[PDB]
Amino acid sequence: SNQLTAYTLRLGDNCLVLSQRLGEWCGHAPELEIDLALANIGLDLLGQARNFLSYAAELAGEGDEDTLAFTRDERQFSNLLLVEQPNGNFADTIARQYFIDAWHVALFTRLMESRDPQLAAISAKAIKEARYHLRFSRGWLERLGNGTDVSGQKMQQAINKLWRFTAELFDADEIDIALSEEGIAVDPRTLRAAWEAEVFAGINEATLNVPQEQAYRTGGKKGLHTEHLGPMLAEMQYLQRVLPGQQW
């Protein structure tokens, strides 16, 4: 049960942490239409986080989505390093979003065939949303990459700056592997072909270059984060830490 719980929790944390980042954009976007789109995506991802986290709490037999989101520290959080990256400029946000959306589409497509019915059901909902997210993120990848010289440079830099964290998208540990052998989880290594087919094509269509640096950064899944996560949780959890055990 512990492996299943940890796997579900990884997926929830991914969505939770990325949703947090998107929330920071509210009212700060280049256009009102973009403010709307980002709030929408962040709300979708938060809903997904609530689904996975709720399941993880049921699996563990204690707590709920709020104990999980607000009473774990940065060494217990198990999100991808990619989703905790700062928003930076709009291209940085778009690069991070596009890498994640392509991954979510590939993942949720296969995870809706899980032998675990709840994971299958959560993924069946999430995939419909992830498809909307990918259209938006790929659309902006193309607009910025194939816009002006300036936007083309920023989009390339954004891609380059995030690339090292893509390794973790295809990292498999013993939890991944054992559950994948039971037909429950997706072996992340087997996601690479579809993720690269999508992302390589998108980058090329945007008139940009696939970075040549071999991606090397992992650890998020084991609670070994960048120095970005701690300050995120400080902000996210403050009220719950000040006034624990209450209803809101």
Q: What residues line the site for a copy of itself (CB under 8 A)?
A: 73, 231, 233-235, 237-238, 241-242
Give the SS3 label for residue 223: coil
Smaller CB separation from a copy of itself, 70 or 132: 70
Q: Which two three-digit tokens encode residue 227? A: 């120095």
Angle between helix axes 229-242 and 2-24 (nearest 10 degrees) is 100
In 10 A of CB 72, how many CB atoms? Answer: 17
User: What distance in Å separates the CA atoms of residue 222 and residue 49, rounded to the nearest whole number?
Assistant: 18
User: What distance in Å separates the CA atoms of residue 106 and residue 18, rounded to the nearest whole number?
Assistant: 18
The least CB distance from residue 225 to another protein, in Å, is: 7
Q: Is 178 annotated as a binding residue?
A: yes
Residue 49 touches another protein, criterion: CB under 8 A: yes
Residue 90 touches another protein, criterion: CB under 8 A: yes
User: What distance in Å separates the CA atoms of residue 156 and residue 88, rounded to the nearest whole number?
Assistant: 14
Residue 36 touches another protein, criterion: CB under 8 A: yes
Residue 117 touches another protein, criterion: CB under 8 A: no
Give the per-residue contact string, 193-222, with another protein (x = CB under 8 A; - = no). Answer: -----------------------xx-x---
Q: Is 99 annotated as a binding residue?
A: no
Tell me which residue of 44, 21, 167, 31 sits closest to 92, measured CA to CA: 21
Residue 100, binding choice from another protein, a copy of itself, none, Cβ under 5 to 8 Å by partner class: none
Q: Which stretch binds another protein (CB under 8 A): 99-107, 122-130, 148-156, 193-201?
A: 148-156
Given 3, 60, 66, 180, the residue binding another protein (CB under 8 A):
66
Q: Is 203 annotated as a binding residue?
A: no
**Amino acid of residue 212:** Q
